[PDB]
A paper describes a structure:
To enhance the resolution of the capsid region, we used local reconstruction methods to determine the structures of individual subregions of capsid known as capsomers, which are sub-assemblies that are found at the vertices or faces of the icosahedron. Local reconstruction of the pentameric capsomers found at the vertices provided a map to an overall resolution of ~3.3-Å. The high-quality maps of the locally refined capsomers allowed us to build an atomic model of the Copiagag protein with high confidence and good stereochemistry. The NTDs form central spokes at the center of each capsomer sub-assembly, while the CTD is arranged in the capsomer periphery. In place of the spikes, the [name] capsid contains positively charged pores at the center of each hexameric or pentameric sub-assembly, similar to HIV. The positively charged pores of HIV function as gates for dNTP entry into the capsid for fueling reverse transcriptase activity. We hypothesize that the pores in the [name] capsid play a similar role. Despite the less extensive interfaces between capsid subunits in [name], we observed an interesting interaction between adjacent CTDs that is not found in other retroelement-derived capsids. We suspect this CTD-CTD interaction plays a key role in stabilizing [name] capsids by locking down the periphery of each capsomer sub-assembly.
Here, we show that the Ty1 retrotransposon [name] forms virus-like capsids in vivo and transfers between cells. [name] is enriched at the [name] neuromuscular junction (NMJ) and transported across synapses, and disrupting its expression promotes both synapse development and structural synaptic plasticity. Because [name] behaves in a viral-like manner, we used cryogenic-electron microscopy (cryo-EM) to determine the high-resolution structure of the [name] capsid and found that it is distinct from the related dArc1 capsid, with a larger internal capacity and the presence of pores similar to those used by retroviruses to carry out their reverse transcriptase activity. The capsid layer is composed of the Copiagag protein’s CA region, which contains 2 alpha-helical domains.
Author numbering:
A (entry chain A), B (entry chain E), C (entry chain D), D (entry chain C), E (entry chain B): 3 to 186
The structure:
């Protein structure tokens, strides 16, 4: 019912496990993975085990189905997936942040492609575990721009103080890149 | 079950919150976000909290999952998302309307691309909160056209008075741009 | 559960309303839109109202969500959408049929592109409300062809009399356009 | 719930009807289409009729919604669709098989495009009602190849006798077309 | 409800059967395929048979619907599909591994395309039944690289010992291919 989980393919295991656990908790099945094993198994417990195993099988890619082929419970599958991918880092936060700080808008590139690159970098940083607020995102975006946008920078800083987000800043930046391109 | 909600990525928070609230109300779960906290928690209340948290987790992008990683209720998640994005403007309505009023059909561009641009502008204006009626949409579309369409403008104004919408006007405009292109 | 309804964007309102009404009737909820308002509201009636409003919200585009933002029932939303789009025509049937009758296969164009154009025209005509039988579709397709296909026309007319549909006719036409292209 | 049915657009009516009947039988609703009309209608029968009509409406294209606009039961809709498309042939099996037997791999074309063409032809033949076994598919694929693959043909014939399918044969053929392209 | 199963088209039958069996077990229906035939049939057993047959029909391609057209139970359908595809090999593991070991990064190709090719090869190997650990994947990826990456190889080997996976290794490799391309 929750088709918003990307199948696990060895990348971003923390997000996949979080979404899988949320989905299992939605179906009142997470007690199999988390709760203690009951002394006597009931029909409800067997149904919950089947549902958890089926969900994990559904949200595993064809390459990773070998983790569920053996007659093991969903708890064992998650334990193995943890032992292989639990504490392992997804990327280098310092490298990504160095790339982000070195980002600069080029004359040939338009603001749409630059915004896409900035969004990809920010999304990768946030997926890696870094915590970036909206103000920090805006500051990075503004420092990754040439000096032709100083007018809109001043206007945003002085006027839109209680109304600033990434979307509004990007919209204003595109609005004035239209004028900047016209004035060349 | 409601897969028509775009995951939240920091853009158009009002629409996302409205759709999420509608979906939660559909599942008889919105009482968690809206209703007062009961003195004693029951199994039904815990199930509702789990369902609301799972829904919000499902309809949040991978970048924004940090708002739900902490052991907080769905109400707290929505409160934080509001504190970051509730009253913030999505775009500049005056800038969008200035761009729309300055729109003009060029000789190289066909009516399909012009209609797509007009539709994108109108959709952005409506998402920003502006209220545009069908007559206003038609008036903008007609004033964004050259003088070669005056015949169809007069025919639509005089004949199709109780039958005018954007779709019919666009269809007639394409029908006569065929003839205009033939007569060149 | 019925994800086969295109969200309403101001085009083809009759089809959208028909599909929405069918979906509401499937969920035993159409009594809210159609049935009379009960003297005393019950929990079942409130649940039905919530479900209908949530369904209509789900199957409305982001541009048209303003019809549901106000605290109004699903019946009121449908009444407003009717008052704006109920009896309004979708396109010009005479113009579409004139374009269809004037369709002719060109030497440069292959039969696949011609079939796609013919299918698009027929689909638009049927969506506009016109009633076209299979024999009429076949007749239009055959009269929109050059004289190189007279052999297959005669073979289809004489042999396949109780076995003729658009798909079979198109398949035979492609089969012999292979030979016609070979014989040039 | 069964979103694997392509909406009916006048092509492949047998497959669409088979899938629709299977879906209706899954929901315990096929008794409306198949079973006799009860003397007295009940709430369950009306619910089943609504569900069947809604399912058929959902899995009908916008062009074919005119078959359900009138206040008719799902049984009547299926009866009309049968009267228009039940016994009519989908394509010419002899023509498709003549095209398949005449298929030959060209020097310019790679094995991927040839395999795609062969798969499309086989799929069309199977949809038309023809019965082709795996051995026949393999024989057609092998006879549609040049003499440069005789080594792999002999190896497959002699060694892989209890292990031959279309996928394995295609994989071996690509494996040795790598070598054949290298040896040129 | 489980839309993550690719319809069966004669390729990768083991994965399709595993996913179908998991889905059937989720719905408490696998007892039809696995359990013994009861002496007396009940309404529950007939409902389970209908559900299993409908699921198998849904997750079968249009080419393979002939396995279910006849009035046979889901158990018979699976038995026939096994008799045609159960023990048959999907590809040549030795050929795939020879291709993987011979993989080498070329100057023209970027690391993204090379990573895509490596991922495709590894996925095909894992689908064929081979068991490859994360360390083996990393070793193959590293031996499929030129000598310009020896610095990052040494850094990963010495520093990231308890933190190594394919994703992190690929990210570091791209990070330093940026520098390598800059230094040319």
């Amino acid at each position: 019912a929750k088709r918003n989980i990307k199948p696990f393919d060895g990348e971003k295991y923390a997000i996949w496990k979080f979404r899988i656990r949320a989905l299992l908790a939605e179906q009142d099945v997470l007690k199999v993975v988390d709760g203690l094993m009951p002394n006597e198994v009931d029909d409800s417990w067997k149904k919950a085990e089947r549902c958890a195993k089926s969900t994990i099988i559904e949200y595993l890619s064809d390459s990773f189905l070998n983790f569920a082929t053996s007659d093991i419970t969903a708890r064992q599958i998650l334990e193995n997936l943890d032992a292989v991918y639990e504490r392992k880092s997804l990327a280098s936060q310092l490298a990504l942040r160095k790339r982000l700080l070195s980002l600069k808008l080029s004359s040939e590139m338009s603001l749409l492609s630059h915004f896409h690159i900035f969004d990809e970098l920010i999304s990768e940083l946030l997926a890696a575990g870094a915590k970036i607020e909206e103000m920090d995102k805006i500051s990075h975006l503004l420092i990754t721009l040439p000096s032709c946008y100083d007018g809109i920078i001043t206007a945003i800083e002085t006027l839109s103080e209680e109304n600033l987000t990434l979307a509004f800043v990007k919209n204003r930046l595109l609005d004035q890149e239209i004028k900047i391109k016209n004035d060349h």
